[PDB]
């Protein structure tokens, strides 16, 4: 399966003898699922994301079946707004990110050039939007709130912004705000021709 990124990369999973839909999320170190019934022992754990932090119940050694592919690993359960399949499982279903062909054993970091400034940023199939750390950007903008794992953040919305991402130019909407990582979302990932493969 090759996915383009014009639509959210959703798959069907079977986990805990139940069926679910989840987002293939190159942006996430971990797999996180909305509250659900799992058999066994867990440990308390916190994770951060855009918006802040959530207490999750961590289960290890959980069998999960994603688009016909079996995998065993760690599944976090908690108040995530979306079911997220993280890199811990993407690497197990042989998933790659082509735009170069990037495997997902490490965070898919790239260099960008935006507003005459060099930054690193994360190729994130889980983000409908591009959102960056505080930086000096030219021009006019609008207030916006975006959602994430830990609630909401206030961001500044700049449109028709040029970004070069690993040598490919692209033009569109960049959000600036208190994001823990620089994030390249599907608005721009579609422009440099990114696909997901498993």
């Amino acid at each position: 399966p090759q996915v383009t990124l014009w639509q959210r990369p959703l798959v069907t999973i079977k986990i805990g003898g139940q069926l679910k839909e989840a987002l293939l999320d190159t942006g996430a170190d971990d797999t996180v699922l909305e509250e659900m019934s799992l058999p066994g022992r867990w440990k308390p754990k916190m994770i951060g994301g855009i918006g802040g932090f959530i207490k999750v119940r961590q289960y290890d050694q959980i069998l999960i079946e994603i688009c016909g592919h079996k995998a065993i690993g760690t599944v976090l359960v908690g108040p995530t707004p979306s079911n997220i399949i993280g890199r811990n499982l993407l690497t197990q279903i042989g998933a790659t990110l082509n735009f170069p062909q990037v495997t997902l054993w490490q965070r898919p970091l790239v260099t960008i050039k935006i507003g005459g400034q060099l930054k690193e940023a994360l190729l994130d199939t889980g983000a409908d939007d591009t959102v960056l750390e505080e930086m000096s950007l030219p021009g006019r903008w609008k207030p916006k709130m975006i959602g994430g794992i830990g609630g909401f953040i206030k961001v500044r919305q700049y449109d028709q912004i040029l970004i070069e991402i690993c040598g490919h130019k692209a033009i569109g909407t960049v959000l600036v705000g208190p994001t823990p990582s620089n994030i390249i979302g599907r608005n721009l990932l579609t422009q440099i021709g990114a696909t997901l493969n498993f």
Side-chain angles (χ1 to χ4, degrees):
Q2 193 177 44
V3 203
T4 65
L5 296 167
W6 297 95
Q7 46 209 355
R8 285 198 205 230
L10 298 174
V11 281
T12 297
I13 65 166
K14 179 184 198 177
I15 167 150
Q18 296 146 73
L19 306 181
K20 278 152 182 344
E21 257 203 305
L23 188 66
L24 299 175
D25 197 345
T26 64
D29 302 335
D30 309 307
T31 294
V32 190
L33 304 173
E34 59 169 5
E35 177 52 50
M36 78 176 276
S37 161
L38 285 183
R41 230 183 217 181
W42 53 264
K43 303 171 66 179
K45 177 193 186 171
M46 308 221 73
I47 59 175
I50 261 159
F53 55 87
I54 61 168
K55 249 278 148 59
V56 304
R57 308 196 276 100
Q58 174 181 349
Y59 296 79
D60 313 325
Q61 294 314 94
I62 292 297
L63 166 77
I64 180 155
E65 303 184 56
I66 307 163
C67 225
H69 294 65
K70 291 175 209 155
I72 291 180
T74 307
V75 164
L76 308 181
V77 189
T80 182
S82 312
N83 285 332
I84 278 135
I85 305 308
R87 281 190 309 101
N88 72 300
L89 297 181
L90 293 185
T91 50
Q92 276 199 66
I93 68 188
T96 54
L97 189 51
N98 316 161
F99 68 94
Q101 170 179 48
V102 187
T103 63
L104 282 156
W105 303 89
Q106 291 189 283
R107 290 189 200 185
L109 291 168
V110 284
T111 58
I112 76 195
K113 180 182 193 170
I114 175 184
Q117 299 171 76
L118 307 183
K119 282 182 176 325
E120 273 204 337
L122 199 50
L123 304 178
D124 191 344
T125 63
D128 325 314
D129 302 311
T130 306
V131 55
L132 310 179
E133 57 160 286
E134 256 315 304
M135 62 175 308
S136 163
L137 225 50
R140 200 174 182 192
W141 59 271
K142 293 162 184 142
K144 198 190 195 174
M145 275 135 305
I146 72 176
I149 285 286
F152 282 74
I153 64 166
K154 227 99 162 211
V155 308
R156 309 201 290 264
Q157 175 173 353
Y158 294 71
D159 300 34
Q160 190 133 28
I161 292 274
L162 171 59
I163 301 196
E164 290 193 274
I165 303 163
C166 212
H168 304 63
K169 299 189 201 132
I171 285 188
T173 307
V174 167
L175 308 183
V176 185
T179 172
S181 319
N182 288 332
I183 272 317
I184 308 303
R186 292 192 297 102
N187 65 305
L188 303 183
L189 288 180
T190 50
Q191 283 189 73
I192 68 169
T195 52
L196 211 40
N197 290 77
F198 63 110

